[PDB]
Amino acid sequence: MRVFIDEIARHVDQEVELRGWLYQRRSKGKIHFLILRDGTGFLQATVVQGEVPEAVFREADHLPQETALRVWGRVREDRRAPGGFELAVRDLQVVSRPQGEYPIGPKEHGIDFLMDHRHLWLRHRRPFAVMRIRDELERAIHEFFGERGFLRFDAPILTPSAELFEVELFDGEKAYLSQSGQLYAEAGALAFAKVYTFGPTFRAERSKTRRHLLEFWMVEPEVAFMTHEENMALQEELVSFLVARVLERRSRELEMLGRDPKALEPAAEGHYPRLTYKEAVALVNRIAQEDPEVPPLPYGEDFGAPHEAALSRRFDRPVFVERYPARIKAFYMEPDPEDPELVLNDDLLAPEGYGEIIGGSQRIHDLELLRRKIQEFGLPEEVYDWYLDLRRFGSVPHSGFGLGLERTVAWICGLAHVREAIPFPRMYTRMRP
Amino acid sequence: MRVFIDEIARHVDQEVELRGWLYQRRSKGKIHFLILRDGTGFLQATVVQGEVPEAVFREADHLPQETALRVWGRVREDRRAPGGFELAVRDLQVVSRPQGEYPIGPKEHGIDFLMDHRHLWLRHRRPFAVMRIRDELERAIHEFFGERGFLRFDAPILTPSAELFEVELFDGEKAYLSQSGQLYAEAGALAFAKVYTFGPTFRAERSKTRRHLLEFWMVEPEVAFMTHEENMALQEELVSFLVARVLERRSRELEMLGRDPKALEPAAEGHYPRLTYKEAVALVNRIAQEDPEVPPLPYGEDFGAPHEAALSRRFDRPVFVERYPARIKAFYMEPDPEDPELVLNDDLLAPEGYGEIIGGSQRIHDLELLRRKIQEFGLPEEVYDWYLDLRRFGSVPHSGFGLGLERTVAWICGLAHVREAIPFPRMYTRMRP
Numbered sequence: 001m002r003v004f005i006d007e008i009a010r011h012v013d014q015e016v017e018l019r020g021w022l023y024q025r026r027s028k029g030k031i032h033f034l035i036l037r038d039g040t041g042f043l044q045a046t047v048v049q050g051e052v053p054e055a056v057f058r059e060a061d062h063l064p065q066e067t068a069l070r071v072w073g074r075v076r077e078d079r080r081a082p083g084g085f086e087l088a089v090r091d092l093q094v095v096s097r098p099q100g101e102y103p104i105g106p107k108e109h110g111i112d113f114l115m116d117h118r119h120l121w122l123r124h125r126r127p128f129a130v131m132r133i134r135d136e137l138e139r140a141i142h143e144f145f146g147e148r149g150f151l152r153f154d155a156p157i158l159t160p161s162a163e164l165f166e167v168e169l170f171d172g173e174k175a176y177l178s179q180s181g182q183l184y185a186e187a188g189a190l191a192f193a194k195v196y197t198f199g200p201t202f203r204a205e206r207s208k209t210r211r212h213l214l215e216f217w218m219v220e221p222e223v224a225f226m227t228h229e230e231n232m233a234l235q236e237e238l239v240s241f242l243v244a245r246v247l248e249r250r251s252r253e254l255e256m257l258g259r260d261p262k263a264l265e266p267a268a269e270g271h272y273p274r275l276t277y278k279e280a281v282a283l284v285n286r287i288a289q290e291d292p293e294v295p296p297l298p299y300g301e302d303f304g305a306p307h308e309a310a311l312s313r314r315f316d317r318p319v320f321v322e323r324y325p326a327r328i329k330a331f332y333m334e335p336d337p338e339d340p341e342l343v344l345n346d347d348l349l350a351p352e353g354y355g356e357i358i359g360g361s362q363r364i365h366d367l368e369l370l371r372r373k374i375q376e377f378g379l380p381e382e383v384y385d386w387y388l389d390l391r392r393f394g395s396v397p398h399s400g401f402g403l404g405l406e407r408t409v410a411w412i413c414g415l416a417h418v419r420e421a422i423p424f425p426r427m428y429t430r431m432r433p
Numbered sequence: 434m435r436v437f438i439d440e441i442a443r444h445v446d447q448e449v450e451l452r453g454w455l456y457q458r459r460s461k462g463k464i465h466f467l468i469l470r471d472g473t474g475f476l477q478a479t480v481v482q483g484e485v486p487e488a489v490f491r492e493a494d495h496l497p498q499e500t501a502l503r504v505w506g507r508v509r510e511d512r513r514a515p516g517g518f519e520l521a522v523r524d525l526q527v528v529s530r531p532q533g534e535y536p537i538g539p540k541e542h543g544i545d546f547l548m549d550h551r552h553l554w555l556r557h558r559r560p561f562a563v564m565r566i567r568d569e570l571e572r573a574i575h576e577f578f579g580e581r582g583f584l585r586f587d588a589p590i591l592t593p594s595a596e597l598f599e600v601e602l603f604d605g606e607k608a609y610l611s612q613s614g615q616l617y618a619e620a621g622a623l624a625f626a627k628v629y630t631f632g633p634t635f636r637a638e639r640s641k642t643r644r645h646l647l648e649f650w651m652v653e654p655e656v657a658f659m660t661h662e663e664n665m666a667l668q669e670e671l672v673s674f675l676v677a678r679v680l681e682r683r684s685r686e687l688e689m690l691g692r693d694p695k696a697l698e699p700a701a702e703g704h705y706p707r708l709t710y711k712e713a714v715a716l717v718n719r720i721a722q723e724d725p726e727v728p729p730l731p732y733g734e735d736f737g738a739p740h741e742a743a744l745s746r747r748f749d750r751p752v753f754v755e756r757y758p759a760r761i762k763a764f765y766m767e768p769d770p771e772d773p774e775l776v777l778n779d780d781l782l783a784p785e786g787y788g789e790i791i792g793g794s795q796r797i798h799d800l801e802l803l804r805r806k807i808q809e810f811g812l813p814e815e816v817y818d819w820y821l822d823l824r825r826f827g828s829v830p831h832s833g834f835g836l837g838l839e840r841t842v843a844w845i846c847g848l849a850h851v852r853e854a855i856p857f858p859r860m861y862t863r864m865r866p
């Protein structure tokens with residue numbers, strides 16, 4: 001029967017067919033050591049002279065990289081093979097040979113070259129591991145919220161009015177690409193108690209930093225009656241579950257990426273530290289004095305990326321920063337009962353310098369307060385009228401957050417740039433392939 | 434403990450708290466019959482005079498629609514209540530009262546009014562059922578492909594070049610909203626054997642028909658080494674599994690929509706009929722003679738919606754139509770070995786007049802043939818060069834399809850328009866809220 005390398009350990013000492021591509025070849029006299037990939041993994045396949053037909057052994061002697069082929073053989077249990085298993089080849093059929101030199105040969109390639117050839121580079125071991133860890137998280141997120149009784153609520157991408165990317169529609173009229181679905185999620189929250197969006201979002205960010213895409217995916221849970229304290233608990237619950245799931249089921253992928261499991265274990269176990277904005281600023285300024293490279297943060301200013309980086313390295317797991325000043329936050333955020341100047345909001349910083357992976361807050365449930373803050377921020381009340389209906393009719397305290405998938409993937413996989421954490425990234429100077 | 438109506442049957446004869454909104458009130462002398470919604474369902478809650486405080490019984494006597502409230506009480510097991518359970522109220526706390534008349538009152542509303550107030554209308558029973566059946570399918574799709582060992586492969590939305598919606602990027606440069614991710618999925622297929630995208634797609638369709646959105650979601654599986662015959666089998670496997678899952682777990686939702694389960698049962702059981710384009714055209718022309726309202730289809734012309742509608746009503750479950758003429762299909766489709774004029778492609782038509790829910794084909798794996806067809810269709814070879822790399826390096830026969838989520842939801846829920854099958858639809862004359 002045809003099998004995948006994924007489940008090769010099941011079919012020990014058994015006749016199997018593999019369908020895939022030649023990744024690596026090493027012909028030593030009267031034996032070929034192939035490395036096959038079938039899209040589910042990488043496996044050693046030996047073609048010994050005598051055990052195969054001579055016509056087979058000739059093709060295998062001059063068989064280039066990314067040769068599509070079908071392979072028949074018995075699965076041995078070799079201790080000194082990758083993964084602890086190999087295939088003893090009995091017959092081989094070539095399906096396709098490369099037209100030209102395969103661009104991603106056995107050389108050091110620059111990131112630009114690799115990203116230009118991303119459609120091929122995805123076939124290789126490191127991207128392979130990343131996209132599998134990405135898949136694991138996408139499934140895990142669904143299971144997580146599914147069992148909690150949350151309802152997936154796809155927010156719209158095309159948004160009527162309002163930097164943002166604008167879309168030319170019909171007869172001159174224009175729409176904009178969603179930067180966040182939270183406003184719609186709030187409608188869904190009052191409709192279905194506990195919801196979450198899970199679609200793409202688009203920010204026209206001129207940055208070319210290691211944590212910004214023009215196009216990325218954001219999981220945005222929103223729950224009715226849920227408070228700021230509960231918001232952070234749910235955030236902790238999600239991120240710790242996700243990291244645990246990767247450690248449990250994608251340890252082989254982590255190893256391929258050279259990622260130390262012990263870096264992630266604490267994140268999986270929860271008990272995330274909690275700072276206030278005030279305490280966090282103090283700690284940053286304390287670090288800033290110790291290390292001149294870490295810049296200081298004047299109280300009232302927002303956290304730049306180097307502030308978050310330095311702050312996150314002081315802990316072994318994600319850290320919450322809560323209760324920022326109202327003046328540097330969004331209009332919809334509920335103010336702190338004790339301190340009018342603060343808002344009940346939180347960011348979760350991943351460790352090892354990765355910084356913000358989640359951003360959330362409690363939302364205003366009072367009609368006149370929200371109405372008052374709309375004008376204070378100098379926003380047109382017309383465009384947020386449907387948003388105000390959520391305060392006019394059946395208003396309740398509610399909270400939510402947005403989890404960046406690419407950020408979380410980058411952190412968990414230990415990547416240098418978020419672009420590597422999505423099949424085909426879209427940045428300022430990168431729109432291809 | 435606080436509970437949801439979702440799981441009310443678990444907490445029989447037990448003290449529970451509910452948090453939600455008042456949907457319906459009926460005050461008959463010395464007893465109030467409330468219908469509560471908490472976002473997970475609808476439950477009867479009785480407020481009898483004597484069993485509650487007098488101050489409570491006063492508020493309940495004049496308590497409008499969409500009053501946010503908290504309710505304490507014991508869950509009785511009343512045979513003559515909705516769902517077979519109710520709540521005997523012991524205490525009640527008002528959280529919020531509507532500012533103004535609730536727009537969606539107990540009147541017949543036009544679809545335009547309802548869609549204008551979609552952010553509120555989602556709270557109501559019929560949309561509630563639709564979005565839950567939508568959620569079920571989104572989870573089910575993930576489970577389906579997850580257990581088959583497929584890898585979710587998010588294709589890009591922003592696409593570099595070439596009716597599409599164009600996006601203004603930076604400094605004059607422009608991109609386009611993806612109409613399909615299949616080209617990228619094919620890259621993922623050769624990278625990961627078996628993949629599927631599950632993101633939004635955008636078509637600038639000037640139609641205002643019951644089955645067209647400007648923005649909708651498409652599940653696009655793609656598998657390496659998979660043939661046209663296997664493609665249809667997988668399509669059958671998916672759609673029959675999804676319909677079965679809805680019958681199994683969302684029968685209560687179907688009942689709320691007034692959807693006859695017996696309409697769907699055959700679709701869940703598989704054994705889908707398979708017509709050729711030729712046979713399908715014959716059958717349409719046979720119907721066309723019988724019924725003057727059904728238009729005829731000259732061989733060679735593409736299927737219009739009324740053709741598909743009439744064809745689909747002649748079967749009790751989805752029907753495959755395969756092997757259309759090459760001249761009216763896309764360049765990437767693999768030609769039929771037997772008949773050069775035909776291509777190995779298929780559409781799956783849902784019954785009851787719903788028509789196409791899936792569209793797929795086998796793909797060309799020969800470099801020169803694909804190169805030849807690119808120029809025949811008059812397409813720039815420059816922009817499809819990365820696509821051609823998939824034929825240059827490690828080419829294999831491969832197939833895939835695209836399943837429209839909103840179409841499938843509309844069919845299963847028995848809706849008159851696809852706009853009702855997505856939280857916030859986007860059509861020609863509909864971009865709000």
Ligand SMILES: Nc1ncnc2c1ncn2[C@@H]1O[C@H](COP(=O)(O)OP(=O)(O)OP(=O)(O)O)[C@@H](O)[C@H]1O
Nearest residue numbers: 203211212213216356357358359402403404406407
């Ligand atoms: N351009 C982007 N690329 C990738 N992920 C992003 C991007 N912008 C935001 N995110 C992710 O989405 C989450 C929620 O978005 P939010 O609006 O809170 O971010 P933000 O504060 O604007 O992020 P930053 O300040 O880092 O740009 C963030 O915590 C982050 O993980």
Ligand SMILES: Nc1ncnc2c1ncn2[C@@H]1O[C@H](COP(=O)(O)OP(=O)(O)OP(=O)(O)O)[C@@H](O)[C@H]1O
Nearest residue numbers: 636644645646649789790791792835836837839840
């Ligand atoms: N505008 C749309 N809104 C919602 N679903 C759509 C839309 N266009 C296509 N789909 C869905 O996506 C699937 C794959 O798209 P495909 O390009 O094959 O369809 P199509 O030929 O454009 O269909 P039609 O002729 O009905 O518009 C279809 O089978 C359908 O279920």
Ligand SMILES: [Mg+2]
Nearest residue numbers: 203205207212
């Ligand atoms: Mg930002």
Ligand SMILES: [Mg+2]
Nearest residue numbers: 303304305356
């Ligand atoms: Mg920030």
Ligand SMILES: [Mg+2]
Nearest residue numbers: 347358359360
């Ligand atoms: Mg933030």
Ligand SMILES: [Mg+2]
Nearest residue numbers: 636638640645
């Ligand atoms: Mg179309």
Ligand SMILES: [Mg+2]
Nearest residue numbers: 735736780789
């Ligand atoms: Mg069609």
Ligand SMILES: [Mg+2]
Nearest residue numbers: 780791792793
């Ligand atoms: Mg089609």
